[PDB]
Amino acid sequence: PNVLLQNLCCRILGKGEADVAQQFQYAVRVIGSNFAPTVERDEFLVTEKIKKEFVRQRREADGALFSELHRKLQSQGVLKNRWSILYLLLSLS
Amino acid sequence: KEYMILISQLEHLQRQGLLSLQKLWFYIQPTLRTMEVLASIATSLNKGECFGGATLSLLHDRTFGYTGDSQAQELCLYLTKAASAPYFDILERWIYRGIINDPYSEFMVEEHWDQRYTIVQQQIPSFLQKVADK
Amino acid sequence: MSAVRETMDVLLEISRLLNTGLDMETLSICVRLCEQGINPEALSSVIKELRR
């Protein structure tokens, strides 16, 4: 938990292990107050949102492909909290 | 289409969840309030009034009506700015080129010298008469 | 392990398509956190502040 959270600050900022302290406290607080998901778990809602977004930009070809790739992510059977990851990518577009 | 995505959330809850009378009421209620607003625009058209330009007028008055409750103000706002996109086409074809092309009549100003062009009171744009004679 | 590679590949490609600004190492980290049941909302919020 802690180590991963720290490594993230370290990596994106491109600064070393004890140089991330101030951000490290901000993330721990933001994470600490809203640690767990507050919204229902439902993969389907996110896939539809990601597909409306492509529709919205008329990048429909990238949308069609995105469905193939999402199906591929599911079929491999490796992840379990697929929704969260996809929601995190979508939020970051 | 955005409505229908809400109903499968309910199929997912029948997958994993349990019966609740209130999981229906308290999920449905943000969207049944959108439905009744959207049904009142639609029952005013079902009565056989209005034809095209004054639909837009009634719908504009209604966007001005809904001011107070800011949630469904946005819902009547999305109708009135996506609805007014074909109207503001022929607006711009008329104020910038002076050529009036309609498949039926969508825009009030009707063909048929100093050149006489009649207008109807069947159809009137969203903002009233002082801008319409200009 | 094989499966995991292929999975990281899909994830990297999805990332590229959605033009998010995530690379492989940041994304692996993001995935490991999400899998631990982390709130993605809160997490996105941190990530945007970290990119600023």
UniProtKB/Swiss-Prot annotation, chain A:
Stated name of the protein: Gamma-tubulin complex component 3 homolog
Family affiliation: Belongs to the TUBGCP family.
Provenance organism: Xenopus laevis (African clawed frog)
Domain of life: Eukaryota
Compartmental location: Cytoplasm, Cytoskeleton, Microtubule organizing center, Centrosome
Function comment: Necessary for the recruitment of gamma-tubulin to the centrosome and for the formation of a functional centrosome.
Quaternary structure (record): Interacts with gamma-tubulin.
Swiss-Prot record, chain C:
Location in the cell: Cytoplasm, Cytoskeleton, Microtubule organizing center, Centrosome; Cytoplasm, Cytoskeleton, Spindle
Alphabetically ordered keywords of this record: Cytoplasm, Cytoskeleton
One cellular-component annotation, GO: gamma-tubulin ring complex
Paired cysteines (S-S): none
Domain of life (superkingdom): Eukaryota
One GO BP annotation of this record: microtubule nucleation by interphase microtubule organizing center
Chain's role: Required for gamma-tubulin complex recruitment to the centrosome.
Family: Belongs to the MOZART1 family.
Protein name: Mitotic-spindle organizing protein 1
